[PDB]
UniProtKB/TrEMBL annotation, chains A, B:
Gene label: csy3
Name of the protein: Csy3
Pfam families linked to this entry: Cas_Csy3
Organism taxonomic ancestry: Viruses, Duplodnaviria, Heunggongvirae, Uroviricota, Caudoviricetes
Organism: Vibrio phage ICP1_2011_A
RNA sequence: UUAAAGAGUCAACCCUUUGCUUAUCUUCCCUAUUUAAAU
């Protein structure tokens, strides 16, 4: 039956870095200034479901903030992304299962996956809720001593483009067996003077602060996993629910509380076992299996 | 019964900026000068109720003051207000309850909420206790390269006006779903020569200073919560108590110690449960549910 | 209530010897977000 080995895992083939935020002007984007974090204390009422009696009591909280300087009206977010090859190479286990999985795969078209991966960056999906309130977002991508500038709208409903396709074919060739390529990504906004920026939060136990933000040497930054999550939001190949989601086994959104691709014969493990055991798959299923194999994880139990 | 989910929260759709104050002249409002704070020491008596034996002793305090310079006679306070649509969309949970609430809503008119939000800024209600002492108040409101000047009195008893409608119509157009609109607000006052100003305070524990003031780089300013709270004081929609209060689940004023809209079959959570379960609400109830929904917070448990 | 009765006392060298020891891959993966006037 060629069952999967008890220990089986894959590495991460898309490596992002921690994004850095700077405050620049629209016409003076050469000189950059860092953004501090700080800490403030606020007061408010107690509006909790189930306790009408204590609605007249106060509430004191300590939080962290992040905003642009009042003399600057442009936010610049810069980071680096690395795409590496050598896909279908298990790090733990695999002497027959991995080879059969590779033979069943690699007939798929990496062009669509590569185009969507680059489009998620160029259109401006990698940057989170900071998007709102901006009248102009400019994306600058540097690779192989060749710069590209994008002002593309319509973050959803991936459309056709000429500049994105040029990087797409470059990424597609690297994905199906090559060395590595790198992309330097910069995002420019037009939020305004004194506007609020939303860096990444983190899990913290009980302390003196109720909301503390992530920072490096006191400068507001964003986690690399958050940047990576927005890149792989290309799972459009299921029955309904447009505005797609990230590619994960049992493709689920914890924030919404729903779990698509449940136990109804559409699973990563079901398709993986089916691919090696005789019958092949369709194009969309191959697109999901390859995209989920580019992402890492442990596949065994 | 379609009970609320465990996690359910909505973001804030109105974004105020930290208002900054400058000292200018009545007919020379072109050039502006910053206002400092400094530190002073004061002396007085001890007035404590219930302790008459120690009323003959002194009292020394160290505080912060802020007054406009002796060469100016007017204060200009400026900020920005951003309105963002995409209401009736919960970022924390909600696939059926949120959708049912969205379906039950938009049967009423956003025009009243849009008119009131603009009128609160226009009348000068955003200006705090420092209103007194000035015989003339001016407001300059700028949006889409179109400036308007306001000198309207009677902040209470919302009346009809012509220029307010030309902004309220667009605000009603942004509230029921589209992108962002940013407005710039400036206020001119006539306190006089050497009059003391009243910037925002902070919550601080025991230290050498008994009362300090919020300032950015040595310049007195106001918290964004102070700016945003005065705008939403539109709740003229219950049994009594004219001169309304701000919208809040179990709307209470900790300053007065009384809790309006208490457990008397009029609660925001009760209206949310009732609207989705068959029988709808009245126009005023919808105008309160929507007003509380525009404001952020978490509703669940 | 097998009731009634009764001095165990004295004295002491445990000494001597010792090699524990050789080899080693912990790997893969990840959205913490949602607000509020200083008493």
């Amino acid at each position: 039956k060629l069952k999967a080995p008890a220990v089986l895992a894959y590495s991460r083939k898309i490596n992002p870095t921690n994004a850095l935020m700077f405050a620049v002007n629209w016409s003076d984007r050469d000189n950059t200034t860092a953004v501090m974090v700080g800490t403030k204390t606020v007061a408010g009422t107690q509006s909790v479901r189930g306790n009408p009696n204590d609605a007249d009591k106060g509430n004191i909280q300590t939080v962290n903030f992040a905003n642009l300087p009042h003399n600057k009206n442009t936010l610049l977010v810069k980071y680096n992304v690395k795409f590496v090859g050598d896909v279908f190479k298990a790090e733990l286990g695999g002497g027959e299962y991995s080879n059969t999985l590779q033979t069943a795969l690699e007939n798929t078209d990496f062009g669509t996956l590569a185009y969507r991966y680059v489009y998620n960056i160029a259109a401006g999906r990698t940057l989170w809720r900071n998007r709102v309130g901006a009248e102009s977002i400019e994306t600058v991508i540097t690779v192989n001593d060749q710069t590209f500038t994008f002002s593309d709208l319509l973050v959803n409903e991936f459309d056709e483009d000429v500049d994105v396709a040029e990087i797409a074919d470059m990424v597609a060739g690297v994905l199906s067996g090559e060395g590595f390529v790198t992309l330097k990504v910069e995002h420019y906004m037009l939020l305004g003077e004194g506007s609020e920026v939303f860096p990444s939060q983190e899990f913290v136990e009980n302390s003196k602060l109720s909301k503390q933000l992530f920072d490096l040497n006191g400068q507001a930054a964003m986690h690399d996993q958050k940047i990576g999550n927005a890149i792989r939001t290309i799972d459009t190949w299921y029955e309904d629910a447009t505005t797609p989601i990230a590619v994960e086994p049992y493709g689920s959104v914890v924030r919404n509380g729903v779990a698509y691709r449940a136990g109804n014969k559409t699973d990563l493990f079901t398709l993986m076992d089916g691919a090696v055991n005789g019958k092949s798959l369709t194009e969309e299923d191959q697109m999901f299996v390859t995209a989920n194999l580019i992402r890492g994880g442990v596949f065994g139990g």
